[PDB]
Design an enzyme around this catalytic site. Structure first.
Site, PDB file in Angstrom:
ATOM      1  CE  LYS A 103      87.826 -13.005  21.884  1.00  0.00           C
ATOM      2  NZ  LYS A 103      86.569 -11.412  20.930  1.00  0.00           N
ATOM      3  CB  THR A 151      85.090  -7.758  14.912  1.00  0.00           C
ATOM      4  OG1 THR A 151      86.406  -5.910  15.716  1.00  0.00           O
ATOM      5  CG2 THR A 151      85.779  -7.064  13.619  1.00  0.00           C
ATOM      6  CB  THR A 152      83.098 -11.461  17.238  1.00  0.00           C
ATOM      7  OG1 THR A 152      84.810 -11.935  16.886  1.00  0.00           O
ATOM      8  CG2 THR A 152      82.526 -13.288  16.708  1.00  0.00           C
ATOM      9  CG  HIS A 163      98.113  -7.627  25.912  1.00  0.00           C
ATOM     10  ND1 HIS A 163      98.695  -6.708  26.667  1.00  0.00           N
ATOM     11  CD2 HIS A 163      99.366  -8.719  24.871  1.00  0.00           C
ATOM     12  CE1 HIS A 163     100.316  -6.785  26.033  1.00  0.00           C
ATOM     13  NE2 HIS A 163     100.123  -8.138  25.383  1.00  0.00           N
ATOM     14  NE  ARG A 177      79.170 -14.950   1.259  1.00  0.00           N
ATOM     15  CZ  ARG A 177      79.831 -16.158   1.450  1.00  0.00           C
ATOM     16  NH1 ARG A 177      78.890 -17.162   1.497  1.00  0.00           N
ATOM     17  NH2 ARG A 177      80.794 -15.883   0.856  1.00  0.00           N
ATOM     18  CG  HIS A 183      83.723 -14.444   9.940  1.00  0.00           C
ATOM     19  ND1 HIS A 183      82.998 -14.677  11.178  1.00  0.00           N
ATOM     20  CD2 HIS A 183      83.621 -13.087  10.550  1.00  0.00           C
ATOM     21  CE1 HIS A 183      82.926 -14.095  11.547  1.00  0.00           C
ATOM     22  NE2 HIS A 183      83.174 -12.729  11.488  1.00  0.00           N
ATOM     23  CD  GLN A 203      91.672 -14.628  18.236  1.00  0.00           C
ATOM     24  OE1 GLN A 203      92.130 -13.540  17.993  1.00  0.00           O
ATOM     25  NE2 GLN A 203      92.528 -15.378  18.641  1.00  0.00           N
ATOM     26  CE  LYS A 251      85.746  -8.630   8.809  1.00  0.00           C
ATOM     27  NZ  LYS A 251      86.396  -8.342  10.321  1.00  0.00           N
TER      28      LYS A 251
HETATM   29  C1  LIG Z   1      90.206  -9.138  23.609  1.00  0.00           C
HETATM   30  C2  LIG Z   1      89.670  -8.286  21.927  1.00  0.00           C
HETATM   31  O1  LIG Z   1      90.908  -7.750  20.883  1.00  0.00           O
HETATM   32  N1  LIG Z   1      89.319  -7.372  21.065  1.00  0.00           N
HETATM   33  C3  LIG Z   1      88.373  -6.582  19.994  1.00  0.00           C
HETATM   34  C4  LIG Z   1      88.309  -5.063  20.017  1.00  0.00           C
HETATM   35  O2  LIG Z   1      87.604  -4.639  21.073  1.00  0.00           O
HETATM   36  C5  LIG Z   1      88.737  -4.013  18.778  1.00  0.00           C
HETATM   37  O3  LIG Z   1      88.056  -3.199  19.376  1.00  0.00           O
HETATM   38  C6  LIG Z   1      88.995  -5.174  17.798  1.00  0.00           C
HETATM   39  C7  LIG Z   1      89.902  -4.115  16.666  1.00  0.00           C
HETATM   40  O4  LIG Z   1      90.875  -2.618  17.092  1.00  0.00           O
HETATM   41  S1  LIG Z   1      89.740  -6.243  17.198  1.00  0.00           S
HETATM   42  C8  LIG Z   1      88.384  -7.916  19.061  1.00  0.00           C
HETATM   43  O5  LIG Z   1      88.002  -8.195  18.624  1.00  0.00           O
HETATM   44  P1  LIG Z   1      87.201  -9.394  18.506  1.00  0.00           P
HETATM   45  O6  LIG Z   1      85.605 -10.234  18.454  1.00  0.00           O
HETATM   46  O7  LIG Z   1      87.392  -9.706  19.612  1.00  0.00           O
HETATM   47  O8  LIG Z   1      87.332 -10.284  17.150  1.00  0.00           O
HETATM   48  P2  LIG Z   1      89.636 -10.490  17.536  1.00  0.00           P
HETATM   49  O9  LIG Z   1      89.803  -9.412  17.926  1.00  0.00           O
HETATM   50  O10 LIG Z   1      89.097 -12.019  17.804  1.00  0.00           O
HETATM   51  O11 LIG Z   1      89.745 -10.593  15.417  1.00  0.00           O
HETATM   52  C9  LIG Z   1      89.075 -11.526  15.421  1.00  0.00           C
HETATM   53  C10 LIG Z   1      88.946 -10.946  13.402  1.00  0.00           C
HETATM   54  O12 LIG Z   1      88.569 -12.438  12.229  1.00  0.00           O
HETATM   55  C11 LIG Z   1      87.378 -12.229  12.322  1.00  0.00           C
HETATM   56  N2  LIG Z   1      87.425 -13.651  11.310  1.00  0.00           N
HETATM   57  C12 LIG Z   1      86.803 -14.567  12.397  1.00  0.00           C
HETATM   58  C13 LIG Z   1      86.881 -15.459  12.275  1.00  0.00           C
HETATM   59  C14 LIG Z   1      86.043 -15.779  10.830  1.00  0.00           C
HETATM   60  O13 LIG Z   1      86.427 -17.102  10.304  1.00  0.00           O
HETATM   61  N3  LIG Z   1      86.642 -15.434   9.868  1.00  0.00           N
HETATM   62  C15 LIG Z   1      87.362 -13.716   9.819  1.00  0.00           C
HETATM   63  O14 LIG Z   1      87.446 -13.187   9.110  1.00  0.00           O
HETATM   64  C16 LIG Z   1      86.684 -11.429  12.542  1.00  0.00           C
HETATM   65  O15 LIG Z   1      85.886 -10.514  11.554  1.00  0.00           O
HETATM   66  C17 LIG Z   1      87.544 -10.354  13.278  1.00  0.00           C
HETATM   67  O16 LIG Z   1      87.939  -9.083  12.059  1.00  0.00           O
END
Ligand SMILES: CC(=O)N[C@@H]1[C@@H](O)[C@H](O)[C@@H](CO)S[C@@H]1OP(=O)(O)OP(=O)(O)OC[C@H]1O[C@@H](n2ccc(=O)[nH]c2=O)[C@H](O)[C@@H]1O
Length: 698
Positions: free
Chosen positions: A513, A592-593, A185, A574, A572, A510, A569
């Site tokens: 990255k 996801t971000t 991972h 909005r 974030h 996060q 969620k």
């Molecule tokens: C490398 C990696 O993990 N990649 C994964 C993908 O390949 C997978 O397909 C994804 C799901 O299967 S997870 C992942 O996608 P990522 O962009 O990495 O997000 P991550 O796993 O760090 O989560 C941040 C969360 O915080 C939420 N978020 C963020 C900031 C905030 O202030 N509030 C909040 O709710 C966000 O809406 C997110 O829901």
């Protein structure tokens, strides 16, 4: 006792080899010959722990300690068992007791570090990992786990050296058929070869095949036509993340949009029910929902799947929190595909396909993967945003002095509120439709007042007007994305201490990255664009002084990087409306971000890399139809970013394009995505009904 010692030593080698059943029998013969053999009890316990026999393990650890009360290794390993049973207090009592017995016991310090990290105490985990490495300087697990802690907080002390050392440790462990210390991972974060990333994952696949061989499963017999299933593909989705998890935030609509004439949908949860609407929805809409968290033995759980009659078993976890790849090693279905959850190769032979796309995984890198490439026609990425945040499909703004992103309103009933107001101006949008503007009147002043005072909500003309910072106090299920907000929400740059009069570049990932290169590109961009700020999150908060220092050293003045807390969620998603531009992380993109920021209408500049994880944002942007935002190198990333921050008409154009295309394009269209996924699934099934082997699908 030496009859006993040879049985014990054989067992240790049988275990190291992966002959787990053989090792168990020998440890028991060892204890048959010599009952009071502390080391045999502790070793039997460790292998029972590996097999998931956690209560039986605990019992043998305590025997070991009863025979030898200063056996620090027993306490250390017992602690790991209690940690797997979720007994964090018991885990700490054991680790700390092992360190009290022998303060020089490096493994105990490493185990303790690991529980600090899991608890969100990164500075203590770092301190304990360094104690471990001081006591035992050749300790790959502690070194690599420490490199991950330092990544999380953007500690880049001796970065290039650390990076070299991670690679050479992995090379050395790969030579000697040792499980690598870099977790699959994390492998995308480090300058490893593709062979090393594939090799890392291959060996976690191998360790599952060893664990299931104790069960002695005969290969399962797989249906070779759709006769038993009334002409329907039986598709099984396996996930630890059916609940409040990013995965559900991407795909919760997919099960219930499957065409029931041709598909029968099985959802296999590996997690218990967290009480959230995400789990409720997938349970309600899947044809069949099975809680495998209630079926802990993997043999009886892969049985539970074979008797459902699954044709395509979909693995949404990869090497993550709560995966059970044991289920897929036992191949309880003829087609096994990697989908959406894990941004890499399984490295396993027992997974046939990876569902990906041509931008994410071009054919020229097909040997970077153990699986065959199964292309979706647009992106493999999907988001449930159109369903979860429909209040962001439209917005209005308040004209404070015209900007699209200083003071923003969003609501299901926004049109009715606007129509209650005298003199609202409509601005036709520069799109390849319109933004209502509320002029600076009594009404406008009342809203800005509520923001300035930190007031939770007010009422104008009978409409509920909520402070976007207070959503958990008004409706906690709207804050999590479980419910659509039922009030009009106000979002402003003042709420986040952002400048009203400058470009806001954002990145809401996060902090792990980010790497030195990335922050140097960002500082370059900020220096070219006076005024402008970079908007990051305290993700975690202890990462902020590092980022701020390394940026101070890159000559970037103070007060050019603004940090906000991690938000619920919907806040974030909005609040991304307040940014001008999102600067994606090239080491590991927003996944996801990336979907979150595009839903707000915020253009994202990306630089696709080698790894699947470094190319997801460029795939999203291609599907969205914004090729101008994909950079082929760092100069182009900076030039695109600087242009969007200076050419304001070009900024307005590009934003208008993202705003319209988030609806027009396929990117957020879950029905179209499900239909394309269905086409690709029937291709996979044909190719094997005709008894061919898995092959690339383009
Ligand atoms: C490398 C990696 O993990 N990649 C994964 C993908 O390949 C997978 O397909 C994804 C799901 O299967 S997870 C992942 O996608 P990522 O962009 O990495 O997000 P991550 O796993 O760090 O989560 C941040 C969360 O915080 C939420 N978020 C963020 C900031 C905030 O202030 N509030 C909040 O709710 C966000 O809406 C997110 O829901």
């Amino acid at each position: 006792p030496t009859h006993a010692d040879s049985l014990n030593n054989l067992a240790n080698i049988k275990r190291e080899q992966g002959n787990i059943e053989e090792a168990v029998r020998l440890y028991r013969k060892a204890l048959e010959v010599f009952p009071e053999f502390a080391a045999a009890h502790s070793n039997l316990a460790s292998v029972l722990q590996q097999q998931g026999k956690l209560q039986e393990a605990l019992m043998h650890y305590k025997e070991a300690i009863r025979i030898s009360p200063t056996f620090a290794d027993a306490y250390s390993n017992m602690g790991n068992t209690l940690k797997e049973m979720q007994d964090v207090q018991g885990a700490l009592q054991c680790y700390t007791r092992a360190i009290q017995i022998n303060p020089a016991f490096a493994d105990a310090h490493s185990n303790l570090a690991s529980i600090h990290k899991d608890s969100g105490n990164i500075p203590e985990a770092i301190a304990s990992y360094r104690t471990a490495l001081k006591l035992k300087p050749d300790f790959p697990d502690a070194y690599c786990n420490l490199a991950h802690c330092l990544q999380i907080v953007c500690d880049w002390t001796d970065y290039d050296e650390r990076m070299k050392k991670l690679v050479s440790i992995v090379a050395d462990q790969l030579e000697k058929n040792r499980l690598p210390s870099v977790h699959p991972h994390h492998s995308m974060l480090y300058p490893l070869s593709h062979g090393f990333r594939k090799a890392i994952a291959e060996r976690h696949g191998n360790l599952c095949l060893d664990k299931i061989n104790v069960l002695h499963k005969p290969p399962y017999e797989h249906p070779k036509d759709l006769k038993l299933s009334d002409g329907r593909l039986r598709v099984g989705y396996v996930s630890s993340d059916f609940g409040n998890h990013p995965t559900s935030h991407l795909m919760q609509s997919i099960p219930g949009m499957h065409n029931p004439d041709k598909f029968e949908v099985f959802c296999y949860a590996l997690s218990p029910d967290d009480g959230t609407n995400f789990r409720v929805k997938v349970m309600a809409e899947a044809n069949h929902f099975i809680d495998l968290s209630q079926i802990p033995c993997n043999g009886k759980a892969a049985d539970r799947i074979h008797q459902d009659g699954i044709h395509i078993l979909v693995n949404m976890n990869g090497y993550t929190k709560g995966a059970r790849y044991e289920l897929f090693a036992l191949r309880p279905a003829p087609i096994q595909a990697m989908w959406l959850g894990y941004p890499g190769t399984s490295g396993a032979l027992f997974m046939d396909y990876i569902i990906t796309d041509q931008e994410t995984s071009p054919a020229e890198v097909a040997e970077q993967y153990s699986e065959k490439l199964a292309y979706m026609p647009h992106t493999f990425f999907i988001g449930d945003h159109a369903n979860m945040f429909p209040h962001l499909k439209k917005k209005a703004v308040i004209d404070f002095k015209i900007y699209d992103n200083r003071i923003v309103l969003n609501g299901i009933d926004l049109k009715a509120f606007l129509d209650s107001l005298p003199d609202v101006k409509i601005v036709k949008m520069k799109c390849p439709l319109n933004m209502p503007v509320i002029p600076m009147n009594t009404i406008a002043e009342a809203v800005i007042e509520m923001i300035n005072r930190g007031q939770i909500q007010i009422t104008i003309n009978g409409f509920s007007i909520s402070n976007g910072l207070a959503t958990t106090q008004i409706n906690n299920k709207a804050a999590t994305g479980e419910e659509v907000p039922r009030t009009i929400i106000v979002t402003t740059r003042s709420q986040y201490g952002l400048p009203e009069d400058a470009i806001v570049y954002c990145n809401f990932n996060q902090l792990y990255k980010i790497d030195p290169s990335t922050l140097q590109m960002w500082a370059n961009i900020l220096k070219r664009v006076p005024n402008s700020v970079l908007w990051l999150l305290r993700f975690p908060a202890v990462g902020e002084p590092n980022i701020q220092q390394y940026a101070q050293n890159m000559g970037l003045p103070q007060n050019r990087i603004i940090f906000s807390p991690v938000a619920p969620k919907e806040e974030h998603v909005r609040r991304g409306q307040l940014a001008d531009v999102c600067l994606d992380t090239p080491l590991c993109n927003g996944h996801t971000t990336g979907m979150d920021v595009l839903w707000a209408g915020t253009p994202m500049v990306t630089m696709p890399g080698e790894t699947l994880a470094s190319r997801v944002a460029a795939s999203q942007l291609t599907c969205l139809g914004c090729l101008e935002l994909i950079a082929k190198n760092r100069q182009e990333y900076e030039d695109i970013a600087v242009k969007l921050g200076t050419d304001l008409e070009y900024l307005k154009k590009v934003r208008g394009k993202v705003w319209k295309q988030r609806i027009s394009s396929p990117l957020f269209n879950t029905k179209q995505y499900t239909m394309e996924l269905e086409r690709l699934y029937l291709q996979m099934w044909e190719h094997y009904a005709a008894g061919n082997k898995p092959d690339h699908m383009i």
